[PDB]
A paper describes a structure:
Although ACE2 is hijacked by some coronaviruses, its primary physiological role is in the maturation of angiotensin (Ang), a peptide hormone that controls vasoconstriction and blood pressure. ACE2 also functions as the chaperone for membrane trafficking of the amino acid transporter B0AT1, also known as SLC6A19 (25), which mediates uptake of neutral amino acids into intestinal cells in a sodium-dependent manner. The ACE2-B0AT1 complex exists as a dimer of heterodimers.
To gain insight into the interaction between ACE2 and SARS-CoV-2, we purchased 0.2 mg of recombinantly expressed and purified RBD-mFc of SARS-CoV-2 (for simplicity, hereafter referred to as RBD; mFc, mouse Fc tag) from Sino Biological Inc., mixed it with our purified ACE2-B0AT1 complex at a stoichiometric ratio of ~1.1 to 1, and proceeded with cryo-grid preparation and imaging. In the middle of the bridge, Lys417 and Tyr453 of the RBD interact with Asp30 and His34 of ACE2, respectively. At the C terminus of α1, Gln474 of the RBD is H-bonded to Gln24 of ACE2, whereas Phe486 of the RBD interacts with Met82 of ACE2 through van der Waals forces. The overall interface is similar to that between SARS-CoV and ACE2 (7, 8), mediated mainly through polar interactions. Structural alignment of the RBD-ACE2-B0AT1 ternary complex with the S protein of SARS-CoV-2 suggests that two S protein trimers can simultaneously bind to an ACE2 homodimer.
Author numbering:
A (entry chain B): 60 to 738
B (entry chain A): 345 to 416
C (entry chain D): 603 to 738
D (entry chain D): 128 to 195
C-alpha cells in the first residue's frame, strides 16, 4: 500500500502532462532532440477508445494473466493432485525421459489453457486493432514495429515495414547452420527415443526440453559430443579460496575499470543488497539492475558462490555501466537506443568473462591448464542450443502474430496456419491434431501477457556485431569465441561512444559508432559458430539434412475416410457441417464399444473426444485415429479399428444414408455376398 | 477429384479441360502419377461387331439396362 | 395434505416418454438393446438439439450425450428423458423446444436404429403430413 | 477429505467440502446454487467411491464369515 499510492501519483501525473503536450504541434519543430522528447510524451496509446471499451480491454488482460498463473493439471490416475505450471509442469518437461509422461504434460496443459485463452484472445485482437488505428497505424503489429522507426536524419532513416524484410533477409543465412544443428539433434534423439522419431522427418513437439521448444538447452545431456570430457566449471576453486559475497563484484568492477570505464558510484556499496539478508526476510530474490534516478544505482540479487552468479554479476553490472553513461541526457531519452540494445550490452560482458583465457588471469585456473579442441566443441554446442535453437522459434512466432493483426489469417485458420509454419520454418511436428478450439500461441507467457517478441531476435544479432567489432579493436588473433576485451582501452572507447547516446540519436546512427554499418548483420553471428559448423558437416555425412512436412507421429494408425454425398442422394442431400462430424465421431465410438464387448469381453467407455480428426477437405475427406478414453498416449492399433468398423459398417451407413460406395474407408473393402437360388 | 480433393459439384463435362490445366499449375509433382483415359466417340461407335457378336454381346448388354428386362 | 406421493419428481414435467418395439420392426433378426444402444440414442438426441438451435435460433450450443438424462428404463424398452444446457445443470430445456427439435430430425433418428415411426414412438409427438395423389 | 469442486464459470476456483461447500448448503436460499453444489460433489465423489466401495463389500463379508 506504500507503493500503490506512490505508484499512482506517478501515473496520474504523466497523463496530465500528456494532455498538455497536444497544445504544441509536432511538425512546427526543427531541433531533432526537442522533437524526439515531444513525440514520446504526446503518445496517446490507450484512452483513444470509448470508456466502456477501455475497461473491457483491461478486464481481458487481467483474466488472461490469471489463467496463465493459476492453471491446474489433473493426473488421470489421481484427480486429487493438480500440478500448476511453474512448480511441477516445468520440471517434467525439463527432466523427464519418459515419452508417455512428456506427451501427457504437453497435451493437457495445452488443451485447457488453450481453450480458455481462445475466446479472450479473439476479443483481444479486435480491441487492440481499434486502439492502433485510432493512433494512425494500420494494425497493432505496425504499432509494435514503431520502436525501430527513424524519421528524417539525413541518411539514417528506417521504415516500419523495412523491419519485416531485414528479419527475413537475415534469416535465410541462418538456415544452413540451423539445418545441420537440426539434423545432429535428430540423430541423437533417436538413441534416446527409439521407435518414435523418423530419420527424415520433423521433431515431435514434446521432446525438445521445455513446454514450447523455445530453448533447446535441456537437450545437452543427450546431445553432448564428448561426454568423457568435463565442461569447465570453476565453482570449487571459489570455495577453496574463501571468496565472500563481495569478491564476485569487486572482480567484476576490476573487469570494467580494465577496459576504461568508471568505477562504481560508492553509493553502490551501501544501498545495494547483494545477498538475501541475515534476517529471514521476505524479499523477491531476482537478479536485476535498478536506476531509481538522481544518480542512484542499485543492484538487487541474492548471490551464491557459483560461476553461474559470477557470470550474471558481470551481466547485471553491464546494465549499470550502460545506465551510468547516458545519465547526462534529458529524462525522456534515458533508455536504450531501441528495445534490443539494453540486453545486448549486458551479454557481451558475460561472454568475455566466461572464457578460459580470462579465468586463468583472474586467478581461478591452474596455470598449467590445457584447452583441447574436444572441449571447444562441447562449449560451442551448448551455446548453439540456446542461441541458434531459439532463432527460428522467435522468427516464426512474430511472423504469425503480425499476420493475425493485419488480417492475412482469418480466425477459422489460426491453428491451421500455426502448425503449417511449425513444420516449414522450425521443423517441429505436433503429436496430436489440434482444431480451432485450441489456442497454442496463447499458452506462452509473452502472448497472453501482452508483450512484444521481436526484441529477442534482434538482440541476438546485435550481440555478436558488438563482440566482433570490439575484438578487432583489442587486436585479437584467434577465433571469435576465445576473445577477451580485458586490459584494452581502445575497445572501451569504441564502446563508450555508443553507451552515452541514449535515445538522443537514431539507433542506426548508434550502430556505426561501434560496428561501422547502418543495419543489423548476421555474418558476425556465423563467424562465432564456424568451428561448430565445420564439425557438424562432418557428422552429417551419412545423415539426411532437412525435413519433410508430411510425416506425423500419428499418421500410420490413421484411416482415411471419403464421403460422396451427391452421388448417393444428389439433388436432395444434406450439407456437411460440423454437426455431422459430431455424429460421425459418436458412431465410431459406438462401433469401438461394441467390438471390445463382443470380441474382447471388456467394457471401455469410448467417447466422441477419443476420435481425433485431421485434414478436413472440401471433397469431404479426413483422417482419424482412436485413443484410449483418458490415456492420450495410448493409440488403438489400425488393425483393431478395421475389425471394429467391419463389424458395424452396416450401422454407420444407415445413420448417414450411404451405401458402401459413398462412405469409403480406404484400406477396408467389402468382401462377402455369394449369389444363387436356382436349385 | 480424388487426387486433389475437390467437391463433386464443381468438376463436370463442361469444364474438364479447364481445370486439369489448373492442377498441373498448382502441384506439378502430384499431377504426374495420375492417369487420364483418352476416349471419344467414333472410337466407341467403331468396334468388334464380328459374327455372332451383335445379338449376343451388343443387344444382351443393352437389354439389362431397360426396366422390365426379362420381358425385352 | 398429510403424507406424500412417490410418483412426483421435480424433472418429470419436461420429460418425454420413448417406447421402442424392436421385434415388431425387424422380428427374427433384430439386435438386442444393451447400454451401447443407449449411448447411441443419447448422441442422436444431442445431435438433433444441435441442428435445431443452429438453423432456427442461429446459436451454436455444444450438446453432448451427458446432457441427456435418462430415467426409468424398463424391459419393454421405455424410458423418460429430458435435455439440459451443457454445463448448467439447473437449466432444463423446455418440453416444447425438444418436441420441435425431434420433429426436425425424426427421419434421421429412425435411420440410425432402422425403425419406422411406429416402432420408435415419442409419446406426445405425432406424425402429421403426407397428402396423397398423382392422377391429374 | 480432499475433493475439489469446480464452479463452471471459473475453473480456477475449486471448493473443498468442509470450507465452502458446507456453507452453501447451510446458508444459501438460491435454488440454482444449492442444486449445483448437491449434484457436482455428489457425482464426482460418487464415481470414485463406487469401484472402491464395491471392492470393500466383498472383503468385509469375507472377514465376517471367517468369524462365524
Ligand atoms: C537544439 O540544437 C542545438 C544544436 O543543434 C543544441 O545546442 C547545443 O546546446 C548545448 C547546451 O544546450 C551546448 O553546450 C552546445 O554547444 C550547443 N551546440 C551548438 C552547436 O551550439 C541545443 O541544445 C538543442 N536544444 C535543446 C533544448 O537541447
Ligand atoms: C490524441 O487524441 C486526440 C483526440 O482526443 C487526437 O486529436 C485530435 O486532433 C485533431 C486534428 O488531427 C483535432 O481536430 C481534434 O480536435 C483532436 N482531438 C479532439 C477532438 O480534441 C490526437 O491526434 C491524438 N494524439 C496522438 C498521439 O495521435
Ligand atoms: C583435435 O585435434 C586432433 C589433432 O589433429 C585431431 O586428430 C586428427 O584427426 C584427423 C581426422 O580424424 C586425423 O586424420 C589425424 O590423424 C588426427 N591426428 C592425430 C595426431 O592422430 C582431432 O580430430 C581433433 N578433434 C576435433 C573434434 O576437431
Ligand atoms: C591484464 O590485467 C591484469 C590485472 O591488472 C594483469 O595482471 C597482473 O599481472 C602481473 C604479471 O602477470 C602480476 O604481477 C599482477 O599481480 C597482476 N595484477 C593483478 C591485479 O592481479 C595482467 O598482466 C594484464 N595483462 C597484460 C597482458 O598486461
Ligand atoms: C497409457 O498407455 C501407455 C502405452 O501407450 C502405457 O505405457 C505402458 O506402461 C507399461 C507400464 O507402465 C509399460 O510396461 C509399457 O511398456 C508401456 N507402453 C509403451 C508403449 O511404452 C501407460 O501405462 C498408459 N497409462 C495408463 C494410465 O494406463
Ligand atoms: C443456469 O440456468 C439458470 C436458469 O435455469 C440461470 O438462472 C437465471 O439467472 C438469471 C440471472 O443470473 C436470472 O435473471 C433468472 O431469473 C434465473 N432463472 C431462473 C429460472 O431462476 C443461471 O444463471 C444459469 N447459470 C449460468 C452459469 O448460466
Ligand atoms: C577506482 O577505484 C580504485 C580503488 O577502489 C582506485 O584505485 C582507482 O583509481 C579508481 N579509478 C579511477 C579512474 O580513479
Ligand atoms: C467449384 O469451386 C470453384 C472454386 O471455388 C468455383 O470457381 C466453381 O464455380 C465451383 N463450381 C460450381 C459452383 O459448379
Ligand atoms: C502440366 O501438364 C500439361 C500436359 O498435361 C503440360 O502441357 C503442362 O506444361 C504441364 N505444366 C507444368 C507446369 O509442367
Ligand atoms: Zn538482464
Amino acid at each position: 500500500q506504500n507503493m500503490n499510492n506512490a505508484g499512482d501519483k506517478w501515473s496520474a501525473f504523466l497523463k496530465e502532462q500528456s494532455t498538455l503536450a497536444q497544445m504544441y504541434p509536432l511538425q512546427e519543430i526543427q531541433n531533432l532532440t526537442v522533437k524526439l522528447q515531444l513525440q514520446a510524451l504526446q503518445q496517446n496509446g490507450s484512452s483513444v477508445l470509448s470508456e466502456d471499451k477501455s475497461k473491457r480491454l483491461n478486464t481481458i488482460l487481467n483474466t488472461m494473466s490469471t489463467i496463465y498463473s493459476t492453471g491446474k493439471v489433473c493426473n488421470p490416475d489421481n484427480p486429487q493432485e493438480c500440478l500448476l505450471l511453474e512448480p511441477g509442469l516445468n520440471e517434467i518437461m525439463a527432466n523427464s525421459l519418459d515419452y508417455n509422461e512428456r506427451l501427457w504434460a504437453w497435451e493437457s496443459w495445452r488443451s485447457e489453457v488453450g481453450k480458455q485463452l481462445r475466446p479472450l484472445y479473439e476479443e483481444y485482437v479486435v480491441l487492440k486493432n481499434e486502439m492502433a488505428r485510432a493512433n494512425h497505424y494500420e494494425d497493432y503489429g505496425d504499432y509494435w514495429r514503431g520502436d525501430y522507426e527513424v524519421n528524417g536524419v539525413d541518411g539514417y532513416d528506417y521504415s516500419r515495414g523495412q523491419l519485416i524484410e531485414d528479419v527475413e533477409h537475415t534469416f535465410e543465412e541462418i538456415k544452413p547452420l540451423y539445418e545441420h544443428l537440426h539434423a545432429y539433434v535428430r540423430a541423437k534423439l533417436m538413441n534416446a527415443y527409439p521407435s518414435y522419431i523418423s530419420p527424415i522427418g520433423c521433431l515431435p513437439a514434446h521432446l525438445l526440453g521445455d513446454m514450447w521448444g523455445r530453448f533447446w538447452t535441456n537437450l545437452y545431456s543427450l546431445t553432448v559430443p564428448f561426454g568423457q570430457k568435463p565442461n569447465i566449471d570453476v565453482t570449487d576453486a571459489m570455495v577453496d579460496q574463501a571468496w565472500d559475497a563481495q569478491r564476485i563484484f569487486k572482480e567484476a568492477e576490476k573487469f570494467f575499470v580494465s577496459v576504461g570505464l568508471p568505477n562504481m558510484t560508492q553509493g553502490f556499496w551501501e544501498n545495494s543488497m547483494l545477498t538475501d539478508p541475515g534476517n529471514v526476510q521476505k524479499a523477491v530474490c531476482h537478479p536485476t539492475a535498478w536506476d531509481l534516478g538522481k544518480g542512484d544505482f542499485r543492484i538487487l540479487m541474492c548471490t551464491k558462490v557459483t560461476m553461474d552468479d559470477f557470470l550474471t554479476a558481470h551481466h547485471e553490472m553491464g546494465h549499470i555501466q550502460y545506465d551510468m553513461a547516458y545519465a547526462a541526457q534529458p529524462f525522456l531519452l534515458r533508455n536504450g537506443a531501441n528495445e534490443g540494445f539494453h540486453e545486448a550490452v549486458g551479454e557481451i560482458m558475460s561472454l568475455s568473462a566466461a572464457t578460459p583465457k580470462h579465468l586463468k588471469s583472474i586467478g581461478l585456473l591452474s596455470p598449467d591448464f590445457q584447452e583441447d579442441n574436444e572441449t571447444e566443441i562441447n562449449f560451442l554446442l551448448k551455446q548453439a542450443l540456446t542461441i541458434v535453437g531459439t532463432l527460428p522459434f522467435t522468427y516464426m512466432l512474430e511472423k504469425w502474430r503480425w499476420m493475425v493483426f493485419k488480417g492475412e489469417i482469418p480466425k477459422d485458420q489460426w491453428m491451421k496456419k500455426w502448425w503449417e509454419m511449425k513444420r516449414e520454418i522450425v521443423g517441429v511436428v505436433e503429436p496430436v491434431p489440434h482444431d480451432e478450439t485450441y489456442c497454442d500461441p496463447a499458452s506462452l507467457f509473452h502472448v497472453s501477457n501482452d508483450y512484444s517478441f521481436i526484441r529477442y531476435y534482434t538482440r541476438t544479432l546485435y550481440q555478436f556485431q558488438f563482440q566482433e567489432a570490439l575484438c578487432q579493436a583489442a587486436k585479437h588473433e584467434g577465433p571469435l569465441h576465445k576473445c577477451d576485451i580485458s586490459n584494452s582501452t581502445e575497445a572501451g572507447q569504441k564502446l563508450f561512444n555508443m553507451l552515452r547516446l541514449g535515445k538522443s540519436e537514431p539507433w542506426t546512427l548508434a550502430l556505426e559508432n561501434v560496428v561501422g554499418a547502418k543495419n543489423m548483420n548476421v555474418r558476425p553471428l556465423l563467424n562465432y559458430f564456424e568451428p561448430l559448423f565445420t564439425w557438424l558437416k562432418d557428422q552429417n555425412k551419412n545423415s539426411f539434412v532437412g525435413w519433410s512436412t508430411d510425416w506425423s507421429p500419428y499418421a500410420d494408425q490413421s484411416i482415411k475416410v471419403r464421403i460422396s454425398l451427391k452421388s448417393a442422394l444428389g439433388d436432395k442431400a444434406y450439407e456437411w457441417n460440423d454437426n455431422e462430424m459430431y455424429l460421425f465421431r459418436s458412431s465410431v465410438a459406438y462401433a469401438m464399444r461394441q467390438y471390445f464387448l463382443k470380441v474382447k469381453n471388456q467394457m471401455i467407455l469410448f467417447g466422441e473426444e477419443d476420435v481425433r480428426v485431421a485434414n478436413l477437405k472440401p471433397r469431404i475427406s479426413f483422417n482419424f485415429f482412436v485413443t484410449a478414453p483418458k490415456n492420450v498416449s495410448d493409440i488403438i492399433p489400425r488393425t483393431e479399428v478395421e475389425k471394429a468398423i467391419r463389424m458395424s459398417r452396416s450401422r454407420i451407413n444407415d445413420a448417414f444414408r450411404l451405401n458402401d460406395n459413398s462412405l469409403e474407408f480406404l484400406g477396408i473393402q467389402p468382401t462377402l455376398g455369394p449369389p444363387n437360388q436356382p436349385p | 477429384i480424388n487426387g486433389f480433393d475437390l467437391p463433386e459439384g464443381n468438376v463436370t463435362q463442361e469444364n474438364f479441360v479447364d481445370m486439369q490445366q489448373r492442377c498441373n499449375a498448382s502441384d506439378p509433382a502430384a499431377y504426374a502419377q495420375l492417369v487420364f483415359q483418352t476416349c471419344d466417340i467414333n472410337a466407341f461407335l467403331s468396334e468388334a461387331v464380328e459374327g455372332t457378336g451383335l445379338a449376343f454381346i451388343v443387344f444382351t448388354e443393352a437389354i439389362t439396362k431397360m426396366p422390365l428386362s426379362p420381358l425385352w
